[model samples]
Target: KGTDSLKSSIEKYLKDKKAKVGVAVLGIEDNFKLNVNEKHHYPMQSTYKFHLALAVLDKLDKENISIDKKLFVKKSELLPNTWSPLRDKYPDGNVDLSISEILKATVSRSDNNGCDILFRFVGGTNKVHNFISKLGVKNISIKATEEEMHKAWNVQYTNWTTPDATVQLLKKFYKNEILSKNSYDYLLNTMIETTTGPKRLKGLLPDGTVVAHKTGSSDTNDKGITAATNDIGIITLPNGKHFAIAVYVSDSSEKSDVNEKIIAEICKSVWDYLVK
Candidate 1:
């Protein structure tokens, strides 16, 4: 198939770097699939938020939690050294945001504080994992808070997922079989509206190519090593068809731009193949 070209491109992009990359692509057609090192486990970083959101929403649906439920966030809760566009806007950090607002900030803006807030809202880390386990997802681990992930390099690796597993998660989500209609649509739209990592998966695609994706990144270490750079989501083809994609670049010492470019080119290659 077209995978040879895509493989060459991905390898070329990773040349001379300490990178372990995994990719999985699945078109709407049952037999249409391409997997490269898809069984390898890679640190999830903020990609866990995507799964966390689904789990939380699932619990909400089960408990009949209103989307309009308001939660008050204290300024003291805004932990340091993590992305928080919500905190950036409200510098003082004390704000009363509804569940809808919190989710929008968490998913669209990659807000770290908002992530933990939601984690707390639905019990804790164990509860999130139980929900995911109940969904029958395997080869995935969800274990650390955003704060814990930032405190040390190795801690981030605690939460991990394989590329194929991520693809499965995306596929089930796309089929609307994993969440209620309102929750599924809300998460889907939030991903589309996401403002971070625009130059990664959707980068090389045509303008207005509808891609609903979540991106994740680990802080570069003292040696310029990045634990993980990832993007996983569904892409809509021009013919009303769609595919799910998961790309993870781990242990890369390359510049962030180059690492992201690897994912973008892979995506472009996949698009070219699937469109034909």
Candidate 2:
């Protein structure tokens, strides 16, 4: 029985890939754990939107702000040349949106403009950084926006989190340690419906599997090195328990299929290990 393992399995999963892989798998109810490069820095890309969302919801709950509060989205905020369906649907901004609406577009859609707007709405990056830090999840940093990250190649690297912090946050937030019931329900539902990186975390799972997750990816630099490809999720097992897992592929020179497949396969294997 001692020889059976998932730890060394991941250690050997992509041994030949020219990348640094960080993996964390935590059985939320069972308290079982696995790790591989869990402490290394991996650019978070859009995954911080999930963390940003927690701060926004916290701001609402603590400051007595309503999630239904209406706000404006100026066209100037929706910059050119970034991935934003929020911009496409509301091409001519100057429109009103509820906090709930903004949260959906930002977190689920991975909308860059909406991310910046939430950053400003929450006061600053430290608000998110400190709030989560206070909640007991360390090794996380968010120092730039989508626009700022685009302004230069190295900006994205400024925002990073180790796989350890990611899954820890997943476990904490899912257990209702930091958020209200209503707030948790809102974000969980939104993430379950998220559209970005469809081929990452949820990629290899069954069609009807319940996974509330977030995915993050970066543009390939001139040298073709991708700073990060990340996905962290709370996956429900067939046994009615759940687990929090994160797979971060950092400094990858591989193509999208290779990077995404690494996460998909790792998750599928973890799921199999649990349910089998």
Candidate 3:
């Protein structure tokens, strides 16, 4: 458990609308943890992509899926939020990009089209849910694409995971116990390439901090549901110590930068606490 001061700092620091903050830090040497909000579930937004990847690998290996393998463009499957260069309209419209390329786009860029394409290719959201259930993760679920989940949940949302469970899953992956060393390494390298979640913890950490993270977001509709943001993955600090952390913030606050700052501050607190 953390001190009152740390708790107060986050309450005072979080500026996002209707925020929920969950954090877990694992000591690499001992594999022990300091967790806050371990059991609470928050909408995962794009972070669900990792689980999607796991599901894919559970059924197939990375070697079989090409980084340059291409799939066809179907106009019926377009979703919201992120875009795809391979959509129906383009210079070589309706062309193909390797599954590897789409996976990269989905995880690295958080491209909705890329994610949806993968979702469709994998047999839609129901298959993703079925895949997750088989993995033994009881606390998390992906009901649909972010777009479809919105309609189903009546809130434009889809995935959920708690801080405790998120960190636990990452810890399993970090130790190469999730699937296999090669599979886990493939996932970690792919996460390292994720571009959107970098603004927060990645923003404030010392130079050369090795963080493999993912961030998720949903838009503001008529009800003013500003955004849902989450950062979850591994952080290797300068001291050769690694921490598996998951911090999820869902707020309608006007400034997302403030949310990013909350994450940065949390990162610093965990860093200072662990280093000392």
lDDT per residue as tens, model 1, 54-138 = 9778877999998878888999878766688778877787788889988998888889999999999888888888877778888
State each model's CA lDDT, in order. 0.86, 0.87, 0.68
Candidate 2 residue pairs in backbone clash: none
Q: What's the lDDT of the predicted structure labeled candidate 1? A: 0.86
lDDT of 3 by residue, 15-124 (tens): 34356677766665565576666676687887888877766655455346544556776555554333554342343436566677667767777767777777877887
Candidate 3, number of clashes: 10
Pairs of residues clashing in candidate 1: none
Off by over 4 Å in 1: 2-17
Instruction: Please give, for residues 150-214, the per-residue lDDT of candidate 2 as tens digits.
Output: 88889998999888889899998888877788898898999888877778878888887788998
| Superposed Cα deviation of residue 88, candidate 3 (Å) | 9.4
Evaluate model 2: give its lDDT: 0.87
